[PDB]
Design a protein around this ligand. Structure first.
Ligand SMILES: Cc1cc2nc3c(=O)[nH]c(=O)nc-3n(C[C@H](O)[C@H](O)[C@H](O)COP(=O)(O)OP(=O)(O)OC[C@H]3O[C@@H](n4cnc5c(N)ncnc54)[C@H](O)[C@@H]3O)c2cc1C
Ligand SMILES: Cc1cc2nc3c(=O)[nH]c(=O)nc-3n(C[C@H](O)[C@H](O)[C@H](O)COP(=O)(O)OP(=O)(O)OC[C@H]3O[C@@H](n4cnc5c(N)ncnc54)[C@H](O)[C@@H]3O)c2cc1C
Ligand SMILES: Cc1cc2nc3c(=O)[nH]c(=O)nc-3n(C[C@H](O)[C@H](O)[C@H](O)COP(=O)(O)O)c2cc1C
Ligand SMILES: Cc1cc2nc3c(=O)[nH]c(=O)nc-3n(C[C@H](O)[C@H](O)[C@H](O)COP(=O)(O)O)c2cc1C
Lengths: 159, 159
């Protein structure tokens, strides 16, 4: 196939920026992700493309539980902080305060305006990423704000 | 759960705008979609949330074939034209010229800068939408342009 064109086409896709968290006892993982879409109104499903070779994947597949937070428009610095491995500093992950989510006790970054907790319904191991489909079981809004659009950061993850 | 919050959280997600096409003989369907994400680099997978109760879904599930085009930043008018049922006017669909895609003969809207053809690898019937995962088999670029970001239209499809 035309490989240069495939890369350019996939890089024309528009994404937001989100932090996905997971945990199992003392194992905690948090990572910035873009490959996220809603996948039904009823039930309320979210789909996430999750790198197979990652701690997040290992925890999500093992526990069937995840949390996802939307980054605000002024939070590119927070997104940057979750491209590196997750270190817990008391009640912070990579410098950012968290609280346990109400159903599953997953890390919710308090600074981020929108969050959801979700139970995995399906995992399709398609390639170097699995497509994880999860049903929203609880959510919260701290304030309404414009989210961080990947275009505005100059970053890409795709192609 | 907190339903008002769930709606607001899912509506904080960022999407692009794309036209998805499908066909089986004289049956042709084209629709504007937002629930689209890449789902692996290898193989090159795209995932689409496709309304179960739609002609697009019927054709995609039946033939296992789809095409997806990215709308340019100045093409909100084109996006609007594919929220209504698809009528073929010779070599146009809803006023917009198409050509057959090279592998599968699916409608490619010539005005749109980026296109891909894909073969369905997996279909998860999760709810009112199915999550269709497809591998990119051919693609093309007509020109590099900024894509249409859903935020900039004032439209929503989510919650
Ligand atoms: C712009 C951008 C967008 C991105 N979008 C996505 C996206 O959409 N989806 C996605 O998945 N990634 C995406 N990534 C990468 C993502 O941010 C990282 O994979 C994520 O930060 C890793 O989280 P983690 O530190 O908990 O995982 P890890 O890479 O695993 O690092 C955490 C620690 O866990 C250990 N570890 C590694 N593998 C395992 C394992 N299998 N079992 C137990 N422990 C392990 C490591 O040694 C490390 O110390 C993106 C990156 C960028 C730059
Ligand atoms: C902002 C926005 C975003 C959207 N995003 C998405 C998205 O992400 N994913 C998504 O799926 N939709 C999305 N939609 C809706 C999507 O644009 C329409 O479902 C699409 O335009 C329908 O295409 P169609 O006309 O070929 O399907 P149809 O609704 O089916 O209409 C085409 C014709 O086919 C007939 N038909 C209906 N059902 C069948 C059937 N099952 N078998 C055979 N024929 C049938 C109808 O009578 C009609 O004449 C979005 C809408 C908006 C407003
Ligand atoms: C920002 C970014 C962009 C990437 N783009 C591509 C790509 O275009 N094609 C591809 O095959 N892999 C791409 N990859 C994946 C890497 O080439 C490769 O799989 C590597 O293992 C990624 O490791 P890591 O993302 O866990 O750090 C990308 C990874 C990142 C971080
Ligand atoms: C723009 C748009 C937004 C929608 N938002 C919601 C939503 O918030 N919650 C929901 O349950 N359904 C939502 N729906 C789905 C409809 O309420 C309902 O399922 C209907 O059958 C949609 O028909 P149609 O999209 O095929 O025209 C939305 C549909 C559209 C067109």
């Amino acid at each position: 196939m035309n490989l240069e064109a495939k890369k350019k086409v996939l890089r024309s896709f528009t994404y937001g920026l989100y932090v996905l968290t997971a945990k199992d006892g003392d194992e905690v993982a948090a990572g910035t992700v873009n490959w996220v879409t809603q996948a039904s109104f009823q039930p309320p499903l979210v789909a996430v493309g999750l790198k197979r070779d990652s701690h997040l994947h290992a925890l999500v597949e093992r526990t069937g539980k995840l949390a996802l937070m939307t980054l605000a428009h002024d939070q590119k610095a927070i997104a940057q902080d979750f491209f590196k491995p997750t270190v817990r500093e008391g009640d912070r992950l990579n410098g950012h305060p968290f609280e346990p989510s109400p159903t599953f006790g997953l890390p919710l970054l308090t600074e981020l305006p929108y969050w959801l907790e979700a139970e995995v319904r399906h995992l399709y191991p398609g390639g170097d990423h699995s497509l994880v489909v999860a049903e929203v079981v609880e959510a919260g809004v701290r304030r309404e704000e414009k989210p961080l659009v990947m275009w505005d950061t100059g970053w890409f993850y795709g192609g």
